Amino acid sequence: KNTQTLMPLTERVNVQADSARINQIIDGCWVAVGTNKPHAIQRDFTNLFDGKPSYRFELKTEDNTLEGYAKGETKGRAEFSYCYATSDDFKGLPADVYQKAQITKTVYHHGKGACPQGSSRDYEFSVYIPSSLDSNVSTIFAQWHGMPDRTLVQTPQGEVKKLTVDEFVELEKTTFFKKNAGHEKVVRLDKQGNPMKDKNGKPVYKAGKLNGWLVEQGGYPPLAFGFSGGLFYIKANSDRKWLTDKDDRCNANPGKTPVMKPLTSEYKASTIAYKLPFADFPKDCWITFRVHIDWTVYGKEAETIVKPGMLDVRMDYQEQGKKVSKHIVNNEKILIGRNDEDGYYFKFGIYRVGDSTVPVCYNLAGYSERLE
Numbered sequence: 001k002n003t004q005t006l007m008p009l010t011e012r013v014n015v016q017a018d019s020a021r022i023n024q025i026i027d028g029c030w031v032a033v034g035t036n037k038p039h040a041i042q043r044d045f046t047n048l049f050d051g052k053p054s055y056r057f058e059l060k061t062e063d064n065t066l067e068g069y070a071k072g073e074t075k076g077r078a079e080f081s082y083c084y085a086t087s088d089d090f091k092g093l094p095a096d097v098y099q100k101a102q103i104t105k106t107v108y109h110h111g112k113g114a115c116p117q118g119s120s121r122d123y124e125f126s127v128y129i130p131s132s133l134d135s136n137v138s139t140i141f142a143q144w145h146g147m148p149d150r151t152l153v154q155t156p157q158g159e160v161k162k163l164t165v166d167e168f169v170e171l172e173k174t175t176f177f178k179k180n181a182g183h184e185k186v187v188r189l190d191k192q193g194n195p196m197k198d199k200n201g202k203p204v205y206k207a208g209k210l211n212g213w214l215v216e217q218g219g220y221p222p223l224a225f226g227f228s229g230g231l232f233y234i235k236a237n238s239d240r241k242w243l244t245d246k247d248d249r250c251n252a253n254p255g256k257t258p259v260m261k262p263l264t265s266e267y268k269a270s271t272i273a274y275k276l277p278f279a280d281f282p283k284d285c286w287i288t289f290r291v292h293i294d295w296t297v298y299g300k301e302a303e304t305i306v307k308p309g310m311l312d313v314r315m316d317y318q319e320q321g322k323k324v325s326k327h328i329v330n331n332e333k334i335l336i337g338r339n340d341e342d343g344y345y346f347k348f349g350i351y352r353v354g355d356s357t358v359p360v361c362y363n364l365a366g367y368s369e370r371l372e
């Protein structure tokens with residue numbers, strides 16, 4: 001209720017486990033995820049894109065709030081997600097639909113903003129990298145993220161089963177899932193000898209030993225635009241395993257990997273579709289990317305590539321007076337996607353990876369997305 005040159009957008013939504021309230025939605029189409037510090041995300045009336053304010057994202061050195069895969073690893077996040085559900089997506093349904101969705105982390109499957117498996121889509125967004133950004137940042141600024149099968153499990157007998165939502169809710173009563181791995185659900189004892197309770201009543205557990213159950217969770221993003229090691233890069237990832245193997249690292253290093261030569265494992269491929277030295281990426285101007293994706297088609301339980309995907313990217317900006325359009329990924333056949341039931345959704349902002357704490361600050365704007 002007081003206009004400034006930068007206005008913090010501090011509401012955050014857990015899109016897997018919670019519907020977005022009307023007052024958390026941004027510009028009618030986004031919700032924010034990651035650290036809620038006022039400076040992390042602001043509407044920027046000082047740097048306009050298409051004559052409208054843009055979104056200024058910033059993580060400072062201390063803003064890593066998240067844990068990485070490797071021990072003692074951290075990561076930092078302030079992003080917008082184009083995919084979330086609202087209370088209107090559940091209105092009129094039985095009350096247990098939303099309750100069980102929060103439990104299985106499937107609330108967002110009931111909302112807008114995801115494209116289907118194996119579909120064709122066009123995306124466009126714009127970014128502004130100021131001169132002030134350090135050439136050693138390690139950050140992803142736009143990504144298309146997958147949607148894991150939340151009730152797909154491996155039993156303690158090594159068999160892969162797709163549970164119903166109800167069956168999974170039952171499993172969760174006796175299994176404490178540490179990200180993707182099931183653990184004995186041990187009642188946690190307070191120092192008094194008594195069962196500890198949540199802040200707001202709920203009973204609290206902790207993981208005992210691995211109990212044999214696994215669930216699909218996480219995984220690399222199928223497409224990511226970022227900077228790392230002094231390079232701008234576009235990286236596409238493919239996972240054709242029905243149940244993702246979280247331990248199968250297959251993640252191409254941009255600086256060591258040539259373009260369009262996939263790094264592969266039995267089931268995964270990570271491909272650098274494009275890279276450019278940081279010094280050569282245009283600074284202090286708005287750059288517009290137009291991305292066409294034909295998502296790879298996978299064979300589900302057969303774990304096959306039914307049809308490879310395709311990626312095309314144009315990069316447009318003004319230089320010294322005129323329009324420049326560079327066809328930086330030219331209609332490339334590529335493996336891109338994940339073998340899941342559900343498809344993919346877009347996010348932009350700062351996703352600080354590779355255990356980096358170098359500050360990051362840049363602006364993003366102008367997203368649209370069309371079924372074509």
Ligand SMILES: [Ca+2]
Nearest residue numbers: 242243339340
């Ligand atoms: Ca899967």
